[PDB]
């Protein structure tokens, strides 16, 4: 089998994108944020507490014939950004593009944080990491590509997002239309439950290439690219005015600049983030200084590839027995 599901921008930034998911029968479709640096898929729901709800569709499980209690089980989650939810668990089927699984662990948020009900176009979360992060207790539970790998073509899913436009997930194909020249394949680690690669380098703008190894994720539920200080400042060194805000929490630039260009490396291989993507428009409305799209991971722990990244390639994750990445221009 094979699934291809369209995922839209939230919003004129790309500050996240939504891809519809069918739950439950007769179908309820939520749009959720697929997520591959997370394991859990919860979504708001009839048991979401009321003053938390803000415009989300809500999947309710007593609405749907396939769903049953998954008894005593219960999860909680903390994200990278600070945000979290927590519930307790039905199975139901689920579909994404037109690809099915049966007894899916759907996730019920009784409460979600103020960073969840405050954006109203995100009506829960699809995990694609590895499913040894799911939260679910007493007993773990599989994601929705664990559980669909063994019937796809092939046990791969792909990510093309767009830059301010729709882009493609598939699941159990790669799509030769989708990118030009060839794929570059990488080495994985799952040991800490992440889709970790290590990068061979990175060039500002015209700049010579700096080969140096970058560990970090693949992540597309994080809007930037996090990047060892040293990177980062490299970077923007070449921004006139621009400068690391502690107040505004990063790096900030003149609204009027021209940001260059952002390279990195995929073994031999390189992919180039346009200047563009890495602004991230006004701070504030009116203010003429502009959020940066490239921050430091000082302080995070660990380097993460987000969608700033992610954006600029067709991204092949392969779940095969020794998991890689494949990275291609487009």
Same mark, same amino acid.
């Given at each position: 089998s094979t699934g291809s599901a369209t995922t839209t921008p939230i919003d004129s930034l790309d500050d996240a994108y939504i891809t519809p998911v069918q739950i439950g029968t007769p179908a309820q479709t939520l749009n959720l944020d697929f997520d591959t640096g997370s394991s859990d898929l919860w979504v708001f729901s009839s048991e979401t507490t009321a003053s938390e709800v803000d415009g989300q569709t809500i999947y309710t499980p007593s609405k749907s014939t396939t769903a049953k209690l998954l008894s005593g089980a219960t999860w909680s989650i903390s994200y990278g950004d600070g945000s979290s939810s927590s519930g307790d668990v039905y199975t139901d089927t689920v579909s994404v593009g037109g690809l099915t699984v049966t007894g899916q662990a759907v996730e019920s948020a009784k409460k979600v944080s103020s960073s969840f009900t405050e954006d109203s176009t995100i009506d829960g979360l699809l995990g694609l990491a590895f499913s040894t992060l799911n939260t679910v207790s007493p007993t773990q539970q599989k994601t929705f590509f664990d559980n669909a790998k063994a019937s796809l073509d092939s046990?791969? =899913?792909?990510?093309?997002?767009?830059?301010?436009?729709?882009?493609?997930?598939?699941?159990?194909?790669?799509?030769?239309?989708?990118?030009? @020249?060839?794929? #570059?394949?990488?080495?994985?680690?799952?040991?800490?439950? =992440?889709?970790?690669?290590?990068?061979? @380098?990175?060039?500002?703008?015209?700049?010579?290439?700096?080969?140096?190894?970058?560990? @970090? &994720?693949?992540? #597309?539920?994080?809007?930037?690219?996090?990047?060892?200080?040293?990177?980062? %400042?490299?970077?923007?060194?070449?921004? %006139?005015?621009?400068?690391? %805000?502690?107040?505004?929490?990063?790096?900030?630039?003149?609204?009027?600049?021209?940001?260059?260009?952002?390279?990195?490396?995929?073994?031999?291989?390189? &992919?180039?983030?346009?200047?563009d993507y890495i602004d991230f428009g006004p701070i504030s409305t009116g203010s003429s200084s502009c959020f940066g799209g490239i921050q430091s991971s000082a302080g995070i722990g660990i380097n993460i590839f987000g969608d700033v990244a992610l954006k600029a390639a067709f991204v092949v994750f392969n779940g095969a027995t020794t998991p890689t990445l494949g990275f291609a221009s487009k």
């Open positions: 046990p791969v =899913f792909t990510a093309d997002l767009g830059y301010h436009a729709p882009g493609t997930y598939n699941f159990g194909f790669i799509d030769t239309t989708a990118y030009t @020249g060839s794929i #570059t394949y990488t080495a994985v680690s799952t040991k800490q439950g =992440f889709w970790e690669w290590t990068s061979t @380098g990175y060039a500002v703008g015209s700049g010579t290439f700096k080969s140096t190894s970058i560990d @970090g &994720i693949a992540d #597309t539920g994080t809007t930037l690219l996090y990047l060892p200080a040293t990177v980062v %400042s490299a970077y923007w060194a070449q921004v %006139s005015g621009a400068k690391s %805000s502690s107040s505004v929490g990063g790096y900030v630039f003149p609204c009027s600049a021209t940001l260059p260009s952002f390279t990195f490396g995929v073994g031999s291989a390189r &992919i180039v983030i346009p200047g």
